[PDB]
């Protein structure tokens, strides 16, 4: 007996189903670590991260909500992106779009 214990049924949950995704190789060219969140507009991340910004347009990281991907200086890795939904209007970040797309 454990007070308030869960009895989670076994299995897995499929996240962000039915949405466009794409893989991109990213490399941290800066001398300081960079960590990106699950819902940040990837095309507007720290300029030190070198990748095809054009392909990442309207995309965010295809990772569980609230988690992040870290890039130590010089680190290169392939990430999977999932496209934004809703109105697909980007406002904020580095201010490169500030509108639909």
């Amino acid at each position: 007996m454990i007070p308030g214990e869960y009895h989670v049924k076994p299995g897995q949950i499929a996240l962000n189903t039915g949405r466009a995704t794409c893989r991109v190789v990213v490399e941290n060219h800066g001398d300081r670590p960079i960590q990106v969140g699950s819902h940040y507009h990837f095309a507007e991340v720290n300029p030190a991260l070198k990748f095809d910004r054009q392909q990442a347009a309207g995309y965010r990281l295809n990772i569980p909500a609230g988690t992040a991907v870290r890039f130590e200086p010089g680190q290169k890795r392939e990430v999977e992106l999932v496209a934004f939904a809703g109105h697909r209007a980007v406002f904020g970040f580095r201010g490169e779009v500030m509108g639909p797309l």
Binding site: I2, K9, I13, G37, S38, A65, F91
Partner: protein, 566 residues
């Protein structure tokens, strides 16, 4: 991508199909539905989802909620579901999917710059409790009740005076006015009951016009057929409720005479089992009638090994009875029956009794209404197994039936269900957040009218809010003007019209009661059973359709020694 169910539960709380144990009881709830879109759950924190342009939008205050409780596991009379809860203007705005429509799908609860966040992942959220049997013996009772998870208190009294010690009555215009003024200082919603024991209608109308939302008929002031009939006539014309504590002594007649006097008019019977007062030994038979809304007081819930023993002396003090006066002792003894006390738990499990209440400091514990209700459910599951209505391998239905006893049903009985009583859109945002391990025992956060009013708080000078000692302390929602804005004082329609609020210069928000005469047993959520119940005049045995109703006394109960220091 993909994520395992266990890891998912650890991050966002349980989802459809997962089960959660309620505190240390044997009751388990299973998530029935989840209103989220997997991958789009909102989470607050460094680098999380709720940030500008991401989970938070660009809308003005008017187009987004003031507060959002994220990933909450709602337990209410209508369902046990996982969802985000939006609160706007102090009221429940929506139950659904929170976020930013600009980049997220299915957002029904918009988060903007004006949105505060309460992380409810891994927590259970419920409506605030409603105790309709309060004796205003001291103002300290409000904090005790609030801490337990009760946000609305209905009753009567003027302080530690003999009249209030015995009855829930705020006698007359002067005291009613004084108590309505004092109520602004208390962090709970409040409604007052006047003294309904008079055979002159005008003396009752005055009290209603002064502000009471109901009239208490108590045997200590004379629960005679004439008094009862008078109170019900005024109630029928002023849309207020009547609460009854019948003639235990059978002085003016037996239970059948009282029932006859009531004449099929709506009435709320207090402590229908009898120990707390009422025709001996069969007042319990009232739960068979369609116009009776029956409630239990808490010292008899649930039936345990020490119950009978503690009851005698408790009886004496509360009613100003003399243990040397034989008539005073014989009368007390005929009130305490093992037979009816054992039956009461079963009748609750069957839905024949619809409400639970305290009877604060007059044969009842103000901070134990919620706790005792769940102890009864536990003891009943253990003894009787699953309810006929259960579906699936969980206790979901029993949980909905019991939670209704101290939330929606008391609200319906007293004509305030339009304001409080459940988690539905448009109702006042009185919410209680619980950690599963402490469900029903010690809340994590108690929200009043959209503001946190009390919560456990650690060392004030600490670097974080968690270091010891952690104990309950009043928050901003319990302070001065913010409190007034977050609490309600219920008035009768007549008082509201006479401008009582303006005259007494009441500061809190005002709400009016209505629909007290039209509620009947059939309207009590999940508790509308009208059993063909009988009580043996000699043996006191309770029988429904001839079958004997009874249960065994518990030796040990959950939600007890594992949580309290004393």
């Amino acid at each position: 991508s993909n994520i395992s169910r266990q890891a998912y539960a650890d991050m966002f709380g349980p989802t459809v199909g997962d089960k959660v144990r309620l505190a240390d009881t044997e009751l388990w709830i299973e998530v029935e539905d989840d209103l989220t879109t997997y991958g789009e759950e909102v989470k607050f924190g460094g680098g999380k989802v709720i940030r500008d342009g991401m989970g938070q939008g660009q809308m003005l205050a008017a187009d987004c909620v003031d507060l959002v409780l994220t990933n909450a596991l709602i337990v209410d009379h209508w369902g046990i579901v996982k969802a985000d809860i939006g609160v706007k203007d102090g009221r429940i705005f929506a139950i659904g999917k929170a976020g930013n429509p600009d980049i997220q799908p299915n957002v029904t609860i918009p988060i903007g710059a004006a949105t505060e966040v309460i992380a409810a992942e891994g927590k259970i959220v419920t409506a605030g409790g409603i105790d309709t049997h309060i004796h205003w013996i001291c103002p300290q009772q409000a904090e005790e009740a609030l801490v337990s998870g009760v946000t609305t208190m209905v009753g009567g009294g003027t302080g530690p005076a003999a009249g209030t010690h015995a009855t829930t009555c705020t006698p007359g215009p002067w005291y009613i006015s004084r108590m309505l003024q004092a109520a602004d200082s208390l962090p709970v919603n409040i409604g007052l009951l006047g003294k309904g024991n008079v055979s002159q209608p005008d003396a009752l109308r005055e009290q209603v016009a002064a502000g009471v939302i109901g009239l208490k008929i108590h045997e200590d002031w004379g629960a005679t057929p004439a008094a009862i009939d008078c109170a019900l006539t005024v109630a029928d014309e002023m849309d207020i409720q009547v609460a009854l504590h019948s003639d235990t002594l059978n002085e003016s007649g037996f239970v059948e005479d009282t029932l006859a006097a009531i004449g099929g008019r709506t009435i709320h019977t207090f402590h229908t089992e009898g120990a707390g007062g009422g025709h001996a030994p069969d007042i319990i038979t009232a739960c068979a009638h369609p116009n009776i809304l029956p409630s239990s007081t808490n010292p008899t819930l649930p039936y345990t090994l020490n119950t009978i023993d503690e009851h005698l002396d408790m009886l004496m003090v509360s009613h100003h009875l003399d243990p040397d006066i034989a008539e005073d002792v014989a009368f007390a003894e005929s009130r305490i029956r093992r037979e009816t006390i054992a039956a009461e738990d079963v009748l609750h499990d069957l839905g024949a009794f619809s409400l639970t209440s305290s009877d604060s400091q007059a044969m009842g514990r103000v901070g134990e209404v919620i706790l005792r209700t769940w102890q009864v459910a536990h003891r009943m599951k253990v003894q009787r197994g699953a309810l006929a209505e259960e579906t699936g391998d969980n206790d979901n239905f029993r949980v909905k039936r019991y939670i209704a006893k101290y939330t929606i049903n008391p609200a319906l009985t007293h004509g305030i269900a339009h304001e409080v009583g459940s988690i539905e859109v448009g109702k006042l945002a009185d919410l209680v957040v619980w950690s599963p391990a402490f469900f029903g025992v010690k809340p994590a956060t108690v929200i009043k009218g959209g503001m946190i009013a009390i919560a456990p708080m650690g060392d004030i000078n600490a670097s974080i809010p968690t270091p010891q000692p952690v104990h309950y302390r009043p928050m901003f929602g319990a302070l001065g003007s913010a409190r007034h804005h977050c609490r309600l004082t219920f008035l009768s329609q007549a008082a509201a019209a006479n401008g009582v609020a303006e005259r007494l210069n009441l500061r809190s928000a005002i709400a009016v009661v209505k629909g007290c005469r039209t509620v009947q047993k059939a309207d009590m959520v999940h508790n509308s059973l009208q059993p063909n119940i009988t009580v043996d005049a000699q043996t006191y045995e309770v029988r429904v359709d001839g079958e004997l109703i009874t249960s065994e006394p518990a030796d040990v109960l959950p939600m007890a020694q594992r949580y309290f220091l004393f």
